Amino acid sequence: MPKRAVSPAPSENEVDIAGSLFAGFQAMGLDANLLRAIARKGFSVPTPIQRKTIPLILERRDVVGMARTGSGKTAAFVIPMIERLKAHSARFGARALVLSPSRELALQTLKVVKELGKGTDLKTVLLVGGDSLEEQFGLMATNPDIIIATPGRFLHLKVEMSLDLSSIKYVVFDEADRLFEMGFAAQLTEILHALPPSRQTLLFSATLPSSLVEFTRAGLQDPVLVRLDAETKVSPDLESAFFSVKSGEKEGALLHILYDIIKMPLGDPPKPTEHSTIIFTATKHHVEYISNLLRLAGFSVSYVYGSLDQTARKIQVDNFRRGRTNILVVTDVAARGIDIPVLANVINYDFPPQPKIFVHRVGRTARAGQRGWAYALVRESDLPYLLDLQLFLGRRLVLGREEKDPSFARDIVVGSLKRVELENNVEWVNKVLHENEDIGALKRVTAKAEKLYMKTRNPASSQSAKRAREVIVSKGWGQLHAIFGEEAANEEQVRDNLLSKITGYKPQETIFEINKAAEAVRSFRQRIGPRKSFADPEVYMSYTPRVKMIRGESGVKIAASFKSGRFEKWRQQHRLGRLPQVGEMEKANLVRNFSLPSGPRFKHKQMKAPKEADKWRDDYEVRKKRVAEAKEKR
Amino acid sequence: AGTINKPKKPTSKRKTTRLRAKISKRAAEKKRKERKLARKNPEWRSKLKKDPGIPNLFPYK
Amino acid sequence: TGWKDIPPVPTAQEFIDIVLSRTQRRLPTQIRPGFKISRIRAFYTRKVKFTQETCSEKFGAIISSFPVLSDQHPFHRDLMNILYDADHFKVALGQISTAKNLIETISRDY
Amino acid sequence: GSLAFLPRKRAARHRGRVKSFPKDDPKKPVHLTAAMGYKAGMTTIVRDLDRPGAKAHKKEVVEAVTIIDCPPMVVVGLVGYIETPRGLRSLTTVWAEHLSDEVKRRFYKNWYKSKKKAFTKYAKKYAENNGASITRELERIKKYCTVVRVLAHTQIRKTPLKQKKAHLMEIQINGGSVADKVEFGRSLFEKPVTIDTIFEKDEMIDVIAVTKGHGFGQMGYHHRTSVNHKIYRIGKGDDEANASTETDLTKKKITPMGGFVRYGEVNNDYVMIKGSVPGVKKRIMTLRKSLFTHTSRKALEKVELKWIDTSSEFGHGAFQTAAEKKQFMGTLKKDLQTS
Amino acid sequence: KRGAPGGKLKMTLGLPVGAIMNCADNSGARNLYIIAVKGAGARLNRLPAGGVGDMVMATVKKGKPELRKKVHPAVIVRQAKPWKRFDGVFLYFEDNAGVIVNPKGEMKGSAITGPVGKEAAELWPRIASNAGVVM
Amino acid sequence: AKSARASRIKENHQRFKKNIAGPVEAARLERLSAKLMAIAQASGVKSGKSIGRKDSSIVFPM
RNA sequence: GGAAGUCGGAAUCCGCUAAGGACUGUGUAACAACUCACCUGCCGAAUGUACUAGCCCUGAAAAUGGAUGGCGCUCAAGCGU
RNA sequence: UAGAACAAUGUAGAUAA
RNA sequence: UGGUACGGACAGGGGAAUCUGCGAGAUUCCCACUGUCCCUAUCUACUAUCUAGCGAAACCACAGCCAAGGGAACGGGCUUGGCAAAAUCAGCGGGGAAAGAA
RNA sequence: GGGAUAACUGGCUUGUGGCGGCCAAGCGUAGCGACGUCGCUUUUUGGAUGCGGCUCUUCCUAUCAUACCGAAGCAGAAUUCGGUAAGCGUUGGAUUGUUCACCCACUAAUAGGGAACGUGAGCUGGACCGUCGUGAGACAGGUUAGUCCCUACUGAUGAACUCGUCGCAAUGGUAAUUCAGCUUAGUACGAGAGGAACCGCUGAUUCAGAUAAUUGGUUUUUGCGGUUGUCCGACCGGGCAGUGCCGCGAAGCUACCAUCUGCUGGAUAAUGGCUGAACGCCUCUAAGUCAGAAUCCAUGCCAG
């Protein structure tokens, strides 16, 4: 049943830099306590995102930050938060609020904020699913200053207390790209409607989907969207090759890359490795298929796909960063989620629809002046997207071996592969598919996924399609890759002449002509036989540019505003009094009644009395005494 | 077809009064329309008609 | 493995008869003038749409059953080129695709 | 449910009627078709299965069987039927001498206050040289009739029941000329016929009964004719080892320890039949032959028993005989106090 | 080919759709979750169920994280709901347990923890090979 | 599957009835008939040989 | 590549004639072979192409069981005078 | 208003079990 | 005043069980929330066949079995057809109620 | 503001477009004109939608499956189209306000409709006046329409034939369905890959009718045993807590939670034939006749 039960978990990662249409620490001037906390943490120099963002946040401007995971966005918005709050407030009502996608991300934010505010009297609360709604009631009674929450639970508690958020002045959206991918849009909009207009809005993300751009335009007051510069210029130290590959030879071509074009050692390796190969794919089914195929071939491979378990992703990523696995296969969304260290080797299995997505996946490497390699497998159907990539990068295309020494780093050089081994590899793939049934089932699943992904993938441009047809007609599509060698160029050419002049044959008559059908074919042939600078550069205006609905926790459809009253019943349960209205001093007796446990939070909390002792049972008196102890504890 | 073993619903020949009135009215209407079209008559008419003549099988032709 | 599983391709008249019989026999065919104009519209648009997806399904089966010359092994590609004139093969397949598209557009407009 | 059995209605009669006897041809030998019995209960057996092609071939399978006490039936009449454009018509019937008190009670409704004057003039007809009349009726059956049936009744006095009123029915004679079957019946007058003679071991037969009422519209008391039930054993009652097999040498009767629940003890000829049977315990059963020749290997199988359960049915019981119980148990306070 | 066993006799089904199960092999999963039963007959609101030796489709709920949240065919080897064998013996097991098996009938693991049902051992020859206790 | 009323199934059942079950039932019938036969043998007007009369309507009463 | 009347394009003649097409189909890898067109011998007397006019079948049908008023009617108890 | 039959039901709404 | 290294503790219970001779005793299984559904449990209200006695009301032109036809989306009484046998009891899920039209 | 109109479909509907030219039988003495063909739509490289949704009865066939046929490069296997056929069965996920399409899953397959202007039975989710503005309207200003019986189904009784016993059978109802495994057989067939069917045998799904040996479950048996509050002066023995609670618990009853049983003749539709005229060839049809579908009619079965 649950094969494609809902949808391919990694859908797409759409990015819009047209969203650009929005518009030391001591030298930055932080408080002494915050400075000592940062010194304890070890943030000697702020990361580039911090350096560009924190001054703006201190200048009280709403900002959207394009930054990779692990760039330090968490501290980037927590340090200004602590600097702004700087003390616990005796007036009831919180003013710091952050919305995070998942509980793990929320806990990471909790750890960051605690370590960055050790000593300061700020009260920070976590509000995520799986915890007791009563416990969250008690924490709101403790009256925190900072709220770190997941939006669904946030609305649940919002509806349950009818809380007043007018005191909130500081609002942060962490990983809003994940928020919108998981589908938090409507409830986020209702949160925004609840929030007072007089607030400072921070939004940290790695990508800017058009939905997120519209949300920012709707909810942000003059956003000074930010970004870096490694998110534009493909590091010139990146050297790229493109391989014309066939559908049935795709896996064989991927291993020739690994074997003869990369010299990838087999077995467990004896901080990434010297090789450091990442593989970017189209869906999780390709992820599993390629991972298992590589593992059978003998390659130390870790796989990370979209809807993978948290612990599993953690283990695989930790192995890749420690160098226990040298190949890492990711789709797009898992890649964006995981913090990828410096890489030397990038392989694009399925071509990306967006040249900007290609730019991200290749800026994954060739960093800090260290040279990087990018090999991309392209098919005839993906050739228009390759040409769109050409237009985006403004580089020249070299097809096959039109130039003797093409510069693969600055030129987009496309070629085929060593026919000899390519075939010895494709035969191996066919053999393993015929032998291992699990691999065959996986291959069929990825075939269906390929069909679905081709159906749902965004289209190319008309000019790209036309010139793709022209390239396919041209000779440059079918010869070797410049890398191989001029001697190969010699030997390939020794017979390529006759081979090509055989491939380019126009039959005089079909085997059917060799009846009414024969007459129809002859008429068909007769019908469809072949058909018989000067400008001023200074001023030449050119053409190209230079009851509302929300989903509940149970998943069953639930109305937007449904006050179950169980908060009032909570009040009745624990005989409490009226909650402190916004502004009134925190009530220490209620704080002591419901403040917090003694530290570590266990989960295993059932105290059940044992069954009544039986005389015929062996441990009669012992069971009787434990039952007596249980009734004494009550 | 298995009409003999499993006959279907019969078609009633019992004419309803609603149908008899409607068919009489539409017959009269068609006759009047034919008369008006014949009055229009965008066609030529001759005096002498093509007489077929005596059949070849007449014994005394 | 082979190409013996490609479904038979009907002629033009057989195709028209298949599609126009399926739409005749798989949907109700009695609506009355004394019914609501909305229900008359629904009935006729159901007929038109059903004919459209029937034609589209058959054309899609034709387009996806036949092997692609590009992704074949070079021996098979050249063999089929010699035996079948891949140029005419692609031309006929393109005619099928264009007819599918135009049928879809006709259905939408009507 | 099934529109075949609906409108659902109480059975018009408690006995249950055959409604169809097997088609008769002269070539077969002369035989009776049906029989009567009283349901005693059910027990458990095991069978050395010899079904080829089955998963349980050459293995031991535990099956549930039903016991019907079948005291010998007494023949008291002979009925002659004729064929007419309106159907079968009971042309005549001939009764015997010395009708039993139980069948006379069947004829009477209030037998205790009645002067029991039934069939006295018929007995005088037989005994007073109106044997001319008896033979006249017999010859009329000889030369005018096509199908002939025999009136037979059970022995309530032998069945351990509070009733005293016997059950009379017609059992058709098949396989012979009308003359041969009329002579056969006249010979069978005033003689007991046995269930081991009407049926035998290994013979799938038909059981006709009235279902158990489920009242305190109609649920139950419904006439049913259940087909294809393999008779597994015919027990002699006086054999003293009815429940014994050749694998276990235990001298025990079919009656369980303490007797059948709500029925009693089976001391007569009995039939052990595979599966379930319509009707409650002590209800009248009708046993007839299959209307058609069988089409299954299950019909030609030979049932090899291994043992028959004689444990107590009144509760979780576990001893086949009182001897087994006393050997497992030893001696008790009551036994030593009595001794 | 649908994984419906042939020659299986009648026995009581006590593991309906959506049923939590222990995992008996060394494959890396601890529990399974029956979601569908092979060879079942869709009745009005009737929940499909399977007995010992019947193939089902199960999703792992706990175990090795790499295999977690994955769906595999399985065949059940132990059933706590009592059922009768043709020798007249009503029997039941301590828990509900099965083994992950490919559609042909081969096990992913190499050993089975605990006893294996006689019906499963007879129906699937591979389980008879990977079984140490048969009852 | 073929129905219980299929012609070919009926022909197969007829062959089975004629070839095996027939002989088996004939043999058992002979045995039981022999047993029951053994258990059994365990002027015209004043004699009864001349069958005479004992002791709504179809025709219209005249 | 092979194409002999018959995978294809164009012309499509003459002789012998009773008559026979540079061939109407089957068939061969090509032949071959059969067959049609046309002609002769036997048979022996009316045929055979296209239209018209009556009656009849078809020319479209759903959903409770029923209607020339019903039974029923066939050299009629139907149709025409 | 009192006897007999079987007499512990069902539906609906609330209720932290 | 706050950090730095060293030493110790933390990152635990409850219930059910299995195996060896109470035993450092060894081994196996279950503890989450949800504005979600259902079920079980408590409370509340209405819930009732016959018999002795007493004993209304609404409603009521007369009636009350079906199918086709009865031009006026009209049938209950008419045509022609199916048919059709007293008097009751219980169950009741069908009919005997509906438009007015821009 | 006045006037007409005031509902409306009712042998209605269904599969094959319109325009123009050519051609064209008739008719007609230029005009009308079917089928085809040519030109446009239309080609030389593979989201729409803006009242819906459940349980049960019955009917249609415009048939998805099961049954039987005819045709197809139909080798086998899997199929495609078409014909007879309504006996028997006939879904679920994803998304959307909803629906379909597409896609995803089992399954033999998971067809489409009717219950007649109220679309089977049950259930669920406004217009008139008045005041004040006229380049648009406002008024907590007033007024007003909103209609327990009869019969049907079906058991269970019942007077008249003297009661009773054993029977016949007019008429009415009707029941079985699908899949799998072994053998055939790794055989026919096939270069290979692969890969059947008939006979025979054993099971399983659903439906239907019974049944309680066995195995589970239910206790007003208040049967036995244990236990809380209170009371009989204490023990025994007990009462009250609208059956105090708990363990076991027969009998009854139950449960595809248990077990058993479900049957055979004739006439046919498509279609395949034999003999043989029409019509000196020929022809399954004209006279005569053979076979053949889960079809039809009956037996088996229930009622009488």
UniProtKB/Swiss-Prot annotation, chain C:
Localization annotation: Nucleus, Nucleolus
Family that this chain belongs to: Belongs to the TRAFAC class OBG-HflX-like GTPase superfamily. OBG GTPase family. NOG subfamily.
Role, per record: Involved in the biogenesis of the 60S ribosomal subunit.
Protein name listed in UniProt: Nucleolar GTP-binding protein 1
Species annotation: Chaetomium thermophilum (strain DSM 1495 / CBS 144.50 / IMI 039719)
Taxonomic lineage: Eukaryota, Fungi, Dikarya, Ascomycota, Pezizomycotina
Span of the entire protein shown here: 2 to 111 of 661
